[PDB]
Amino acid sequence: LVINPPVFITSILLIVALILTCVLFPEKVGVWFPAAQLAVTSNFGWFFVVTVNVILIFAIYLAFSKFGRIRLGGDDAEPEFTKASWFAMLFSTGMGIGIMFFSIAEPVSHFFNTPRPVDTDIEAAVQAMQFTSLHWGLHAWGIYAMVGLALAFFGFNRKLPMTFRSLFYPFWGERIHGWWGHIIDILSALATVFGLSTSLGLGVIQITAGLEYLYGWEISPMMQAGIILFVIGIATISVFSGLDKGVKILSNANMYIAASFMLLIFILGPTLFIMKGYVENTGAYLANFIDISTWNDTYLGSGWQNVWTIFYWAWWIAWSPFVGSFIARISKGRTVKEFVLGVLIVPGLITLLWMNVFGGSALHTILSGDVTMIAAVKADVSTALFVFLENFPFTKFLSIVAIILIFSFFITSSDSGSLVVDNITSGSNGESPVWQRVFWSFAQGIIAIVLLWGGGLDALQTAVIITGLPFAVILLVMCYSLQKGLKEELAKSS
Amino acid sequence: LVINPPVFITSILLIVALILTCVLFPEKVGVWFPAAQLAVTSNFGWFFVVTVNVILIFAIYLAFSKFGRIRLGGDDAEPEFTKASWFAMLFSTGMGIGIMFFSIAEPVSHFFNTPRPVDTDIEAAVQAMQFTSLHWGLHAWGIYAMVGLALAFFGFNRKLPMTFRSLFYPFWGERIHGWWGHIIDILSALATVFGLSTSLGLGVIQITAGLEYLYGWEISPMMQAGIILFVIGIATISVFSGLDKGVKILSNANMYIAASFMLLIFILGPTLFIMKGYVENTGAYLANFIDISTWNDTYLGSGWQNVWTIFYWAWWIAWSPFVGSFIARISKGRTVKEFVLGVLIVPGLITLLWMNVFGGSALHTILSGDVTMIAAVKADVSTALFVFLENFPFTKFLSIVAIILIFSFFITSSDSGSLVVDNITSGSNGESPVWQRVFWSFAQGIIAIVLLWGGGLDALQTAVIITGLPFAVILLVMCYSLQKGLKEELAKSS
Amino acid sequence: LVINPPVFITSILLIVALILTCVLFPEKVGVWFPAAQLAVTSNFGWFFVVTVNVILIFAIYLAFSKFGRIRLGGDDAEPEFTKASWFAMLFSTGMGIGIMFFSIAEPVSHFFNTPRPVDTDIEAAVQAMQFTSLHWGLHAWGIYAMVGLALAFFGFNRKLPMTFRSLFYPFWGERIHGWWGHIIDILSALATVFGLSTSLGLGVIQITAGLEYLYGWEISPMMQAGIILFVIGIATISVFSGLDKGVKILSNANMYIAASFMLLIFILGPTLFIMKGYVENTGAYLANFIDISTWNDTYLGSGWQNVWTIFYWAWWIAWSPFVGSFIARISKGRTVKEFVLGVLIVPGLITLLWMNVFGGSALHTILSGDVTMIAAVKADVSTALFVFLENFPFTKFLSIVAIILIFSFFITSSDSGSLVVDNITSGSNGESPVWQRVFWSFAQGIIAIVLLWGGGLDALQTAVIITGLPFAVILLVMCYSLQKGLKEELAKSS
């Protein structure tokens, strides 16, 4: 039937409270949401920057010290997931629609609308690619590495349930069960659901922009919700039996077609410029790492960071329980240093390669003289990928491949996240029998539809920033508790 | 009865030789002092930069290697200072009065009078804060860390008196007592006395400047010496028995009221700008660390470094034996890595926090449009803190708190410097009974009058620069001898 | 008799095929050499940058890890060198003639013809010195450190002959003997022969330009051929018995007179500017290390890298069998970490000191107002050192000393290179006998004649870039094989 801690009922109550906030106040929520979002990010952007930087340098320290000799699941455990397939399986479920919606719109947006004042067009493009490298580089995956390492260590080496409530066992003891770890699990479930709803909204907005650009359709008002309902239905079918699609084979096939799409853009585009720009921009991002990682825009105060950088940090921090729990169930016998390296460096380098392959080619097209992408981004940032594919051979085929790639990207993460929310709100792995995951996928669809009806992109950014604000202190306490637990486990072993 | 090494007589003779050189030919020494100072700094600024960078790089190496596993006073020794009080008590006889004089007058001066050319005001403020972070950051405290570490290791592990004569014990034999280590003690006593006279002259160039700004008094020149005589009398009272003031309670309550003053400026000022600028300026100072650490201004040759950067390095290197010997008295059972970390990083970060809290708020007021601090600094740099406190609520109360803060800041340092000088010129802890303490404090005050009458801030700069010039080779030989001693001691562990 | 692997006769056939391509159809080779060179570097400059950066960071890692505890020649090898003779005989034979050619011609060229655009003139001079520091710094000697360390480890710790055929022993096993290490031996012999011919051509055009500027003579190509024939002749009667030059005597004397020449320029020039610019430019080169090490000039596409930095990386990579084999025979018992430090840091710092002493003094002369060096470099780059010595006391004596220094520099490398080519082309150490060292020196000279007659600088750059193109993959496979060999050897220690 139904199993419930009191983390269930008040989570549903908070979700429906935001629902009637966004449906009984239809015109009064379009001014409450961006004002509250702007106040939260303008007062805590320094805290988001400090949290992300502390998390990343803690990942580097935990990989490159004596704490990296620990192996998850004890010294007798085996990896069992065939590391080349493990990289693909962690990349497919843990990423999307980030490298499709924002692979081109973000470097062009940083080109024409610069973060800090710049002199020429070449230096503006260099700054745009280095800020894209900041937003999709080591800082994006250091949070993922910390949460996956903490959840894997405290779910394997300590025999606790793989839950954010049970992660603070060395910091707080067995009194986490008495309503004081319930708030942590409430914030974890809310952050996972709101991040998945933000990804859902970005995916459907890019899909309807591509459908309007390709065939000249008119799906603004209503069948967008039908696209949501169809996608959640096929995702729950993949959750349902008959075939276990969306766990192992669909992730590998999706990564294969994503690599084929990226290689096709790399070959058909300016490959020499792409390779030289990849080397140059990776080196310039590593050289100016501390300068752009801790940049807070305090002197100019232009507010560029509040829509891009702090939104990205709150977005990656709000997807942290879902991807951290997924790679924590995945990595059963990895060395801790090897785990942090394989979650940090290799997916970070692959994401930087995707950013270079798309954004550097777009900036080469812009610097050649073609400024149609600038006007397309200034119209709406959702058509940037398809406008980029317009000046390519096989435009319609590549646009259809991109639409199918987005479709697989946000049909994999919803399937991998429904079980994560079910494990958070049920307290077990096999339990419950499979009806609540369909309800949680439908809740993600309902929240995405409601947020997109009561506001554009800014409603999703608002929701993800507000649920990621207390996760800064949650992840800092998580990092300190992981350091204490690793000290305890290393002092335990001979 | 008095005690008598030769260092006492042929250091007193040097002191009264400079007294005779300045009190006779009064107008003629104003052309010998800054010309000789300018020659020394223009010919050895590269050497000062090389010495400070080598000391800091050596501190980072000695903290993060196998030499950091050594513990002072043997392995069985336990520290007894309750470390949260140790951080404050090294900070009292330690940092100061440099924050209270140059926390505001230095970033405004680097704003309007830039070291290197800039293009706007935002970049000028960023470069001003990063040069301030260079001058009051890790390079400041690394010198203190090495002198304290060398004196503690060669006075606790080697069972020698903590004197600079015994600091070269592995590099030589027992030949230190035969007139060739006496010059080292001559330069150490002169460095302590001249640096404390520079700090006293700066603190008395201040305080009464705020008295003039508050009450419109006329004070100079005759009643200015009365402030010196009164604050030396209270310092010698703190030397005297009955109550042991200026040692522990006045080294903790002063830190408490200084932290309360910093928190009051942080709260009543632009706290969001202060926090964001603190994070951004600390990150930009760490990012551009090697670019501003080794900058010698060779191509421009403007001589900006000659009055700020090389003066600051000569001031730190001239205050080396004072706080180095006192911290070596302080830290008995600290681990070497823990010692270097807690003397370098945490006081450096706290000093950078004070720099950001005052200078970033001053730069925010300047960039808002208020350029009264610019004209105030262009008039005289003594009144910059009080002009900054003018537009704050409770101006008179904060200025009185600042004056009492400066008073306690150098009245602790004068007592600890009398301890250090009467330890160095004695070669013994207890002896002599207290009559040279009052004599050495009175000599410090007399040098303050003599230097302040024959020039303002400039003559103090000449005295500290010419006196700290041979301490560069003294500290380089000290670092090499410390490496030899650590390599000798670490091989002795069974 | 003749030692005849097929490596020898098909290397001879390749060399005479280049002879037939050059002396027949001279306009065809003169129009096809810079086009093919430009195509190769424009398509693989990113690969040259990646290879050089990977080799350098691999040197830093493999010196600063547990692989550095291995000692060449076993644990009781006793290296038989004074650490001064090793450095001097390493520096004299393994460097040239860009210390005499590009010490002044390169920073002045980077001054007036900037790599990337700059605003003022001081920034142009700083950029020129930091790009000279990039070209003559750690990247220049990291390649030598890896090739010398791999050849020394695989020739001493494995009892294998010092040849690039045996350098891939843990990658293929015993398959290196049959026609598969043969091609690597062709590429190695062609690389060292073409690099030595490039150095011979640079030295003789500098000698010709210096004689023309000194005595006002005219130079025919047949007189230049006589200079080559005489210089190869003194080398061949240095190879012959009776007397040996050096084997270390000529190298030590050349190092002594080079140090005396550098000290004379340092003393008689602007010594304060030289020292301050040395400290500042070394710090700025270390600060902007990653930014200029991976800069590929992708956005501008100006082709500044085309003639300067990819030619430099192909030149240092093409001299790698020569210098690597020579340093490998030189050092018999050095610790691997100590070896990489003594080949990387100290010769890199000495080369940066020479670069600062000459180029910073030239830039001081230019920034003072004397712009005759700009017009001299714009006329011909081979007269820059002598034009610099024209505005210098003792012009004729210093020019004669510079000519003798060039003479020693390009007789010592040829004398050490005939032995290296002979050992590579025969497969055995010595016992050739001396009939083909003279022949290989004559072939080196003849290749220099035909490269100078069929083109100026561009033919030498073309030849060295073409033979250095497959050595990028050869050195990457070499680095991976060295890592596998060190991992195999370090596990063999009980």
Short mmCIF file of C-alpha atoms in Angstrom, two decimals, chain C residues 103-104 108 213 261 265-266 269-270 274 357-366 370 372-373 376 383-393 395 398-399:
data_model
loop_
_atom_site.label_atom_id
_atom_site.label_comp_id
_atom_site.label_asym_id
_atom_site.label_seq_id
_atom_site.Cartn_x
_atom_site.Cartn_y
_atom_site.Cartn_z
CA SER C 103 69.05 36.17 -27.30
CA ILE C 104 68.52 39.60 -28.90
CA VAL C 108 63.25 42.64 -30.19
CA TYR C 213 79.20 44.17 -39.82
CA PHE C 261 80.93 37.02 -21.62
CA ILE C 265 77.54 42.19 -20.50
CA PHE C 266 75.87 42.10 -17.06
CA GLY C 269 75.36 47.09 -19.09
CA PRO C 270 72.46 48.30 -16.94
CA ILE C 274 68.97 43.57 -15.68
CA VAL C 357 70.91 39.66 -19.41
CA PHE C 358 70.85 40.17 -23.17
CA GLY C 359 67.20 40.82 -24.07
CA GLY C 360 66.30 43.00 -21.09
CA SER C 361 69.38 45.16 -21.70
CA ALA C 362 68.41 45.43 -25.38
CA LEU C 363 64.85 46.37 -24.40
CA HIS C 364 66.23 48.95 -21.95
CA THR C 365 68.27 50.44 -24.81
CA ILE C 366 65.15 50.47 -27.01
CA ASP C 370 67.58 54.20 -29.25
CA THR C 372 68.48 51.41 -34.17
CA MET C 373 68.09 47.78 -33.05
CA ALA C 376 68.65 46.41 -37.65
CA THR C 383 73.06 41.18 -37.13
CA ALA C 384 71.16 41.88 -33.89
CA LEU C 385 73.86 40.77 -31.43
CA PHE C 386 76.56 42.77 -33.20
CA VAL C 387 74.33 45.85 -33.48
CA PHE C 388 73.70 45.54 -29.73
CA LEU C 389 77.46 45.25 -29.13
CA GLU C 390 78.02 48.35 -31.29
CA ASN C 391 76.46 50.54 -28.58
CA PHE C 392 78.70 48.97 -25.94
CA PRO C 393 82.25 49.60 -24.69
CA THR C 395 82.79 46.68 -29.33
CA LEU C 398 83.26 41.67 -27.55
CA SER C 399 82.30 40.92 -31.16
#
